[PDB]
Design a protein around this ligand. Structure first.
Ligand SMILES: NC(=O)c1ccc[n+]([C@@H]2O[C@H](COP(=O)([O-])OP(=O)(O)OC[C@H]3O[C@@H](n4cnc5c(N)ncnc54)[C@H](OP(=O)(O)O)[C@@H]3O)[C@@H](O)[C@H]2O)c1
Ligand SMILES: NC(=O)c1ccc[n+]([C@@H]2O[C@H](COP(=O)([O-])OP(=O)(O)OC[C@H]3O[C@@H](n4cnc5c(N)ncnc54)[C@H](OP(=O)(O)O)[C@@H]3O)[C@@H](O)[C@H]2O)c1
Ligand SMILES: NC(=O)c1ccc[n+]([C@@H]2O[C@H](COP(=O)([O-])OP(=O)(O)OC[C@H]3O[C@@H](n4cnc5c(N)ncnc54)[C@H](OP(=O)(O)O)[C@@H]3O)[C@@H](O)[C@H]2O)c1
Ligand SMILES: NC(=O)c1ccc[n+]([C@@H]2O[C@H](COP(=O)([O-])OP(=O)(O)OC[C@H]3O[C@@H](n4cnc5c(N)ncnc54)[C@H](OP(=O)(O)O)[C@@H]3O)[C@@H](O)[C@H]2O)c1
Lengths: 299, 299, 299, 299
């Protein structure tokens, strides 16, 4: 496995991150997939309180039990509805304080490495949120703070308050892929200046960028993109890669990216996808990828 | 139930708040009244250490036992005499530190949502008080701070120190009703600028604004006000409301108000009064209320 | 009993403070003397780690066991040698951190009300000391900080750092009596500006100001002072006081004084001396005291 | 034993410090050597998490068990690899937070006196490191911070952040001896201005400065230096010292030095070497040492 700094911090994450979003997958298949990720040298695990409604955190806690704590980077989330009523969601001191001990118990740990504000909450002043994170860092319950689906101006505001209060703000989680490049415009450049690295989701666009679908619904209902993806296969085999490994390597060519999240409940896919870590793609190949995909790419 | 932001904060309170001030009401009637409040969708409960001398907090703790913590906003107080001698009252570091664990034990909770300085204490420097609140917020024993019966200049001073020390100052508890409008002059406008919402008491003026008394002693000894209140009954029925529901809706028309406190040991009154939540009153009706009440209104 | 503010703080102390410095006094006589102080309405108790080498703190803890915590102001000290070697004394983070839990255990309490730096330590930077006090205030182990036998410039420096770090600096303990008035020149005026009240020791000058000695060694070896003290007896009886009660009232006439410490292992003396609390002395009597004592007074 | 201030702090260290770096030395010989150090009046013990991989800390904890805590200054380290993967080393919040409880358990103590950043970590922002130390000082797990093998500009940066955050930065651990004087140029002068004292290692240059080797490999492969060391023997006996005692006294003549570390698993050497504490060397002898050693001295 290869490792990157998560923003300007002493924290190293694996370049491939395992995410266990949940649903009718048996527990036993979730557990053996996490085990496959460990066997592939994945250190860094992404989850959320809301995922399978607490089931995702509980299964990760069980699967990683026994792994020395220093070998794991545990990332989880707060912000999505996990209780009833208007205080059972969002980023208030109340919801965050009433969320963190549940996540620690289910993950079976003393501290969360990265704790991500899951969606910006316009009702919570960022002074309220960041002082709550300060209290949790002082208490040793979280080490580092992240954000997902935040306006760039709010990321900047949070990073500034964090620096003043000694709360490390080091992580942003965008949607990012060969097809979805919205974050290249403003998010990644801003994050890089602020000392924040990306941990990227939908990197395989839910299987569309594995080349598996011949002529999610957004691209599946388009035979043009599916045909253009099939034409990356020669480019991939040229580099001794699967289309999946090429799509994952492509994300990791961005120097603003710390890690690429993979989902999969197939042991063989996890091991194969993990081998994307460390792969340099030639300038020539990156120009030929943009040509093949053309106007199917979202900016 | 309808919900408002408590000042500029991520905290939502129910627009109707249940207060259990105590006395010879049997425990069983207190408990069934709190239960009626829960059944009406009341999330937000007001009490104090001093109320029935600890009995109010103990009965609320018992009645709310089993309710998921995230569904409740628990408000309690410190400042009134609860022990013997000059350190058994007021807002000193000593009295606050020696008060908070008693309130947590009696309420059966890890944290108080809103902890209200009950009456301004001229002997305690506000730097002493606010650093004590900072220590309790750091420790996770209180989330948010409120005040009751404070001069406006002291509210402003506390809000400023709070912002610097990361202590949310979000709540003020005035006397406010169709008849008592003293807080409209300075308190509510100042509080709104400072990001503080009102949780209002004596909203029914101890039953005078239910229309129940035909021709507390302040208005009961005046047949003029009692006659003028009886004349709100047609205005109320016009709107499909009881006089009680009209009085409660009237308070909630103020955008500086987060919640209106109801007291009642009658299940039917609690359920009926709770239905005031969310009711818009027409401009026409608000002009006709001021006409009927005329000079009985205190400004 | 009468009570004063301890400096600019919400803390009230009894005007008469019981000190239990120790030695061959049986435990049973120490315990019954503390009990006599409680019976006289004394709330405020002074001791030190070093006193009878931990025995003073242990006996006070035993005697006050069962008294509601809010009714007591416990004052103890750190700085004098209590262990072997150069880290077994002074005001270093190390010695203070290794001292406080011993004092809490022996006093049988969760927090010390007033914790006094016993003698200024030139080897400890005041930033080191005050940040250690900050950590103990945050932790809820001490409420308020005091000082004894400090240069005035160091009191000022400590008060400034305290205000910045949210550490209340409210108490100074000088030697002060009708005969010893050194603190009137600089200490009391400076302390009053800084919001610090005096808790005064040797107020009876070890029995010299009881009028008991007819014609400590400093004044005992002078028949002039002993004769002048005997001549305060008519002035005292004029005011319906013992010479002891007059000496204690005299200290309490200073508005910079919060409390006067009494030592005594005699129940009758404790009860009699406690009645000094609240006594106003006429301007006429204060001029006649200075005349009788004349040049025996130390300035 | 003689004692010095560790930088500008209230902490006193013994002028001779015992270091137990580990290997096939039986436990019983390590334990009896630490015991010999205690018998010689050594209070101050240096170790590291990494030393004999946790064995050094465990053996020190066992040997010092029963010694009153106030009589000991325990120094340990973090930064060297103690776990697998890139988060099992360095100075990140993660590695420091996951290291400190292990060191406390193995040393059998509530707090480490001096906790030394073992080698500067270019991947960890010093704001991240110093806020982690702040959290540990607030929590009472460490008292004072030190550094080893740091660039002088980073020492200065850390000392500045420490002063702002109330983290005492008082200790630097250089290689320093009669032969190795690199730290005289910049490190010691800078440290003295910043209020940091030296605790020095390789003071006997691994036995080369005992005079024991007649005509480590750096000097052992040079018969010139070994011959020049043998010629310090008359100078040493002139002063009633062994060559070992002269080498240790020489380091302690520097006023920027708080302590000199000795390693030895020989009880007789420990007791003899400890007697170097407090020895003044004449100006004449210090000029004759520089003459004998000449150009073998590294600046
Ligand atoms: N922060 C946020 O807002 C946020 C939101 C959503 C998700 N996330 C995180 O990001 C992750 C995204 O996971 P995702 O699965 O939705 O998106 P994805 O990683 O883009 O899609 C992975 C899917 O593609 C298919 N696939 C992968 N490798 C393959 C191979 N070698 N051969 C054939 N098929 C392959 C698999 O489905 P088949 O069963 O079809 O093979 C697999 O489940 C989540 O686990 C979660 O942790 C974060
Ligand atoms: N912060 C402060 O300084 C402060 C001070 C005081 C109180 N408070 C809080 O505010 C609350 C005020 O309670 P309160 O009862 O004194 O004042 P209130 O709410 O103005 O009066 C309520 C009373 O009016 C009567 N009533 C209500 N609805 C009725 C209906 N539909 N039909 C007939 N009668 C009805 C009931 O008494 P009957 O038995 O006559 O029906 C009831 O007890 C307290 O519980 C406390 O939590 C705060
Ligand atoms: N911060 C500091 O540096 C410091 C230093 C020293 C002490 N202190 C504190 O201050 C206190 C001073 O106590 P102290 O006893 O040394 O000084 P003191 O209070 O000036 O002397 C009291 C003594 O005078 C005698 N006495 C008192 N009332 C009497 C009466 N009505 N009739 C006859 N005799 C009477 C008693 O001794 P007989 O047995 O002769 O009657 C009694 O022990 C200590 O307990 C300690 O807590 C503080
Ligand atoms: N901060 C850092 O980076 C760092 C790095 C390394 C070490 N350190 C610390 O500093 C210490 C250095 O220890 P060290 O032993 O490597 O270096 P040292 O103290 O320069 O060497 C001591 C050695 O010299 C010999 N010796 C000492 N006194 C003697 C005498 N009177 N007669 C004969 N031989 C004598 C002994 O070995 P024989 O068996 O040959 O007699 C002894 O083991 C360590 O224990 C560690 O705690 C710190």
């Amino acid at each position: 496995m290869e490792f990157r700094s998560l923003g300007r911090s002493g924290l190293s994450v694996s370049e491939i991150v395992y995410g266990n979003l949940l649903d009718d997958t048996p527990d036993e298949v979730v557990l053996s997939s996490i085990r496959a990720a460990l066997d592939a040298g994945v250190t860094t695990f992404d989850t959320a309180d809301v995922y399978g409604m607490f089931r995702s955190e509980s299964l990760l806690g069980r699967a990683l039990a026994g792994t020395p704590r220093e070998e794991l980077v545990l990332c989880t989330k707060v912000g999505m509805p996990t209780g009833f009523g208007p205080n059972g969601r969002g980023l208030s001191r109340k919801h965050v304080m009433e969320s963190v001990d549940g996540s620690l118990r289910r993950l079976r740990v003393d501290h969360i490495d990265v704790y991500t504000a899951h969606r910006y909450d316009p009702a919570t002043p960022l002074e309220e949120l960041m002082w709550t994170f300060s209290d949790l860092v002082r208490a040793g319950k979280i080490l580092y703070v992240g954000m997902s689906e935040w306006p760039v101006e709010r990321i900047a505001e949070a990073a500034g308050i964090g620096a003043r209060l000694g709360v490390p703000v080091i992580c942003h989680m965008p949607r990012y892929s060969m097809l979805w490049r919205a974050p290249e415009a403003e998010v990644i450049p801003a994050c890089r200046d602020l000392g924040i690295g990306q941990i990227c989701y939908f990197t395989l666009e839910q299987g569309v960028l594995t080349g598996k679908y011949a002529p999610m619904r957004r691209w599946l209902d388009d035979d043009k993109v599916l045909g253009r993806v099939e034409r990356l296969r020669p480019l991939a085999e040229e580099a001794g890669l699967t289309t999946a490994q090429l799509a994952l390597a492509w994300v990791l060519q961005n120097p603003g990216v710390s890690g690429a999240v993979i989902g999969s409940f197939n042991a063989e896919q996890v091991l194969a996808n993990a081998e994307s870590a460390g792969v340099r793609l030639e300038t020539d190949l990156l120009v030929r990828i943009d040509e093949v995909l053309g106007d199917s790419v979202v900016h």
